[PDB]
Amino acid sequence: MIQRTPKIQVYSRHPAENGKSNFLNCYVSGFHPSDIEVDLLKNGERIEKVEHSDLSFSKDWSFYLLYYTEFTPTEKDEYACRVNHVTLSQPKIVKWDRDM
Amino acid sequence: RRLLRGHNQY
Amino acid sequence: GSHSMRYFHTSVSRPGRGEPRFITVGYVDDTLFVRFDSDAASPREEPRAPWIEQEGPEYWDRETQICKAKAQTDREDLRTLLRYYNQSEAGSHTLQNMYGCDVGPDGRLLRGYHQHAYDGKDYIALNEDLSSWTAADTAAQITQRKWEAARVAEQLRAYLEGECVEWLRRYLENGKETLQRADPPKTHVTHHPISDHEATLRCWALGFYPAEITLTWQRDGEDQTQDTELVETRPAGDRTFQKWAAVVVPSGEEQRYTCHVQHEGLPKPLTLRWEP
């Protein structure tokens, strides 16, 4: 048995342009076992219409999933991905930074 | 397309 | 050039919550083209790429049958693994299997694969000769002898050398407008001061397919490998991928830095700089 904590990236499908629809992505990978909870947050609040890819995995057997939702970035709105996994004592939040 | 074959116990 | 087809399968046991969740997906190169999830209403393998939709009902029926069968046999294999490892019925365990083939640019088999992992660790794998196995531990060595006796590798080899490449070639042809049309990255450099004395130069590669790409920063034509931050290539969610590489540079020296991008969708390697 192994435990591998997820790597997390949160980013947009296209370069963000305030006022323009886009997709907010949270890519979780490198994790084992496969149960994981991923929410995309808008100003600290769970975004309801979030979908995710079908569980798959990498050559080293670690899992990856993409969670995503349509969104329209603005100058003021903050977005984040919140991830929980057996390896995490508390949910981990990674803020969306449009420059990364 | 997928492999179709019998099951081999571990 | 070279191409691959892979089927990934994951069964996860769930003690007091029903049967193992079984999820399997198929890929040709970096394109997901089929998926089956046992937790679906009345599970069926479904297409995930346009070029596979044309396959007839018999294809889909056979695929779904195979998926359903594998979900069931995975449950047996998880029980066997539990037994081998003397593990409790109360814990969740994972059984993964990847198999598939790679073909060269001439469409001929380059390599076949069929390998398994239990709880995230290699368990047993078909070797490149497609006739012998690599068992990762003492339990897997037991399985290995069973599979040797039952001539499993011969059957896998038959598939890997025959149908696997045949169907991969078929998919490559039927989906050639996307699978064989590399989409080069859209690239640009951004500049982000981190103080008045340094700034991050971030070289972006977006919208590219397939995922393989190399992004490097040079300073005066010399690779800045040890000082470059590189993010893992990540899916954009529209079948293409993104990656960036960054370096922190002294303010004033930005123009000494160039980003170099290699991708099969580019005729020639790109060199870009920050263009304020």
Contact C62 B4 (CB under 8 A): yes
- Phi, psi (rounded to 5 degrees) for A16: -70, 140
The tally of domains found in chain A comes to: 1
Rg of chain A (C-alpha set): 14
Q: Is C227 helix (H, G, I), strand (E, B) or coil?
A: helix
Q: Is C48 helix (H, G, I), strand (E, B) or coil?
A: coil
Contact status, residue C113 vs residue C126, Cβ threshold 8 Å = yes
**Strand C3-12 with C21-28, pairing:** antiparallel
State how far the Cα of C50 lies from the Cα of C33, in Å rounded to an integer. 8
Residue found under tokens 């006739």: C131
Documented resolution in Å: 1.9
Please list, in sequence order, all residues whose beta carbon lies within 8 angstroms of the beta carbon of residue C1, skipping any fewer than 6 positions away. C105, C264
| Closest CA relative to residue C45, chosen from C17, C74, C8 | C8
Contact B3 C159 (CB under 8 A): yes
| Closest CA relative to residue C272, chosen from C264, C256, C260, C263 | C260
Contact A100 C206 (CB under 8 A): no
Token output for C228: 């470059």
The arrangement of secondary structure in C182-276, i.e. its CATH architecture, is: Sandwich (2.60)
Burial class (CB in 10 A: 0-12, 13-18, 19+), A26: buried
Strand order of the sheet with strand A92-95?
A: A45-46, A37-42, A79-84, A92-95
With contacts defined as CB-CB under 8 Å, which chain C residues touch B7? 69, 73, 76
Token output for A99: 């420059």
Q: Is C54 helix (H, G, I), strand (E, B) or coil?
A: coil
Q: Please, which experimental method was used?
A: X-ray
CATH of the domain at A45: 2.60.40.10
CATH code: domain C1-181 is 3.30.500.10
Token output for C107: 């469409």
Buried b (16+ CB within 10 A) or exposed e, C139-174: bbeebbeebeeeebbebbbebbeeebbebbeebbeb
Range of the domain at A78: 1-100
Bridge partners of residue C247, in order along the sequence:
C201
Q: Is A29 on the interface with C (CB under 8 A)?
A: yes
State how far the Cα of C205 lies from the Cα of C219, in Å rounded to an integer. 19
Residue found under tokens 């798959």: A56
Q: Where are the domains of chain C?
A: 1-181, 182-276
Strand order of the sheet with strand C270-272?
A: C222-223, C214-219, C257-262, C270-272
Please list, in sequence order, all residues whose beta carbon lies within 8 angstroms of the beta carbon of residue A60, skipping any fewer than 6 positions away. none
| DSSP code at position A61 | S
Whether there are 3 or more C-beta pairs closer than 8 Å between C and A is yes
